[PDB]
Amino acid sequence: GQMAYVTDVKVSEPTKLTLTGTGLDKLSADDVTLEGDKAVAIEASTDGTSAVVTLGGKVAPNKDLTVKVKNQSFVTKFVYEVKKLAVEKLTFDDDRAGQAIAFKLNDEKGNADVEYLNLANHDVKFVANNLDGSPANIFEGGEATSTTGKLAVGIKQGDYKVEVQVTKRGGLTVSNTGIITVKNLDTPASAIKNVVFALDADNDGVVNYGSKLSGKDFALNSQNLVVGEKASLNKLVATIAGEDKVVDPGSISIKSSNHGIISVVNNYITAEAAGEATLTIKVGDVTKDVKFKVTTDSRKLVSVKANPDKLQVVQNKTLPVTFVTTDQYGDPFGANTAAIKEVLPKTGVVAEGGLDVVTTDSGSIGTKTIGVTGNDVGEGTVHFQNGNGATLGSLYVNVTEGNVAFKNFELVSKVGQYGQSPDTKLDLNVSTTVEYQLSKYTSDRVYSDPENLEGYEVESKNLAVADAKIVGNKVVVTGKTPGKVDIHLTKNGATAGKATVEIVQETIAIKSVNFKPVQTENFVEKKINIGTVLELEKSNLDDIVKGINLTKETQHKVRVVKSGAEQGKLYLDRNGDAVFNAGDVKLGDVTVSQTSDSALPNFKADLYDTLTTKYLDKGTLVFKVLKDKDVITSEIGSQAVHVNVLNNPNL
């Protein structure tokens, strides 16, 4: 193989080796073994002269380590030398458990582990201070000093200066300072709506939150656990600043009224014993009590429900049926092939082996949409039974004779609803696409199947409002701008279908601006900026702007971008973090210019340092609020600041 030659091995970090040599780009992680374990990752430089090797664990300092790289062998020792330290400029909550002062040692990525530093013969001391230098009681136990970094639950809000000192036992101390912020991170909820618990049905310790469940996990419908089961939240909806939203799990607290019935560890609940217990779910300062029952009766399949429960299907055609399988508590039950015996009627409406209700799909436990194909013409009821022959549910199937007497252009959401208008309203905030199909109907007006769109064409009669294309046997209409658009389905220039789709898009915008009353500046050393014309509520990040009237009611604040290339961008801060990001709405731009007749040599287009008046400044600054700074005619309002520094007489 390739010549890879190591000239030096050094443990540079608790989990990493640094190799020096040649051809190290040809080394794989498997080629390096430390104390019997192969490395987990290797990152060589582009010249192959060095490589960082990630180990599957931490190393004990001052202990002999045997490192093997291919046929080469080395004996090294980790000498942990703390040379530098960086205290993170983090923001913490004024009332939250599990918070610690973070810091990084040397050029390491990721936070230092105080417990590991203690095992590595290093002691750590934390010293909190108010910005005025006086002690700050923010550490655990209402204290100004700490040996762990853990913060107290109940800290007075403000800014703090914290010092971390790391000292090698019987050696030198390395220390640095940092500024942390104590804010109200808490979710400002006014109400708790839906609280969805999910069973950790496969007992793997994982219950997804804010996404589809995995494995055997299912969302509970009821408030019943069986003794020995474990559960966790899949979602909690709270009303935050007038809008319902899925709360961040880090903001939820869950307490049990009876730990011997249901115990809680980090919002993961365990059914300890049969009986009752109330779970108090806390988001911010608002709570919801959920009364649970712990039973001794294992979940058994009791119900198989079909939607639709009466299927009218054309012979040889396939139609979807959604099956919901449930337990004695009304909770989802994952039914495999053997769980349900599908007893087919002797009229032959469903073919032998044509219906197996299997409801074990991850993310969809207890629910499955399955195609039912019309076999022999007639009527009959499929009965869903368990092993003991008990009836769990049923599906009536009417198989109809096939032909084609009508082809109707229909919304896919209204498929098989004879005579329903294909005309629809498409809201671009909920969805950007709407799907259609050419539905075939029998002479008895029974929905058969979609028409094969091979040879057909589709056209949007207003390309700016929406686009329309044929994807398989569907017409996909893609909405772009508000307005009404006609979609035409044709074949060889003959009309097969027409639909009118009204595209709408409501977006909050600036209706008007209330500027502050401004006066002529006759004096020197006066600072002029955005705050001279717009009422600001100061922030450490982007400031809040008052007087920006919007087209819609909202509890979110209007902010302006403080610095950077996007300085002056006004936006609705929908998540409340004083930074333009995620689902914030751009409302417009604030700009400043000096008029053509101005004599302001120190003028700057910076909204926060526009001008500081000096002797014989004379001119006019125009501050504008526009929907877009690049379109001068998109101006919503302006306010001028008149500058006339008085210096008379001046012989």
Epitope: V127, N129, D132, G133, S134, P135, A144, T145, K161, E163, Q165, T173, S175, N176, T177
Partner: nanobody
Framework: QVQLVESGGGLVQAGGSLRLSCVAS????????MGWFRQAPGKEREFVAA????????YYSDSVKGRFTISRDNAKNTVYLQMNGLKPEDTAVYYC????????????????????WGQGTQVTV
């Protein structure tokens, strides 16, 4: 606010010794670090020595290490500096400074870490 009154600067000869003190008056003297700084006529401010708030650790300027010795007396809230073998090259106004931060030890030589300053006593060798 806390004020720093320093006393002990005079006219010593090449190779002698001089002791200068710094009396403070305000709050708890034992919780903040002390630092001796100097500025030669025409040059910038330069650090000479620093004592940790808790003693047991002293810092010395690379140009004055071995000659001077910084010590403290929390009972009489006074900063001390034993200058031995004084040379003419260190002729400067010796100002004194108390740290702003409670029990902080980092950046003992940086001017930013001291909020209170003295008018400085003249030491001419």
């Amino acid at each position: 606010q806390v004020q720093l009154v320093e006393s002990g600067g005079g006219l010593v000869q090449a190779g002698g010794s001089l002791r200068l003190s710094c009396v403070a008056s305000g709050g708890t003297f034992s919780n903040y670090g002390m630092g001796w700084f100097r500025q030669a006529p025409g040059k910038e401010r330069e650090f000479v020595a620093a004592v940790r708030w808790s003693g047991d650790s002293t810092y010395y300027s690379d140009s004055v290490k071995g000659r001077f010795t910084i010590s403290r007396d929390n009972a009489k809230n006074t900063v001390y500096l034993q200058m031995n073998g004084l040379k003419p090259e260190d002729t400067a106004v010796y100002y004194c400074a108390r740290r702003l931060n409670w029990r902080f030890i980092s950046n003992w030589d940086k001017e930013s870490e001291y909020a209170y300053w003295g008018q400085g006593t003249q030491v001419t060798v």
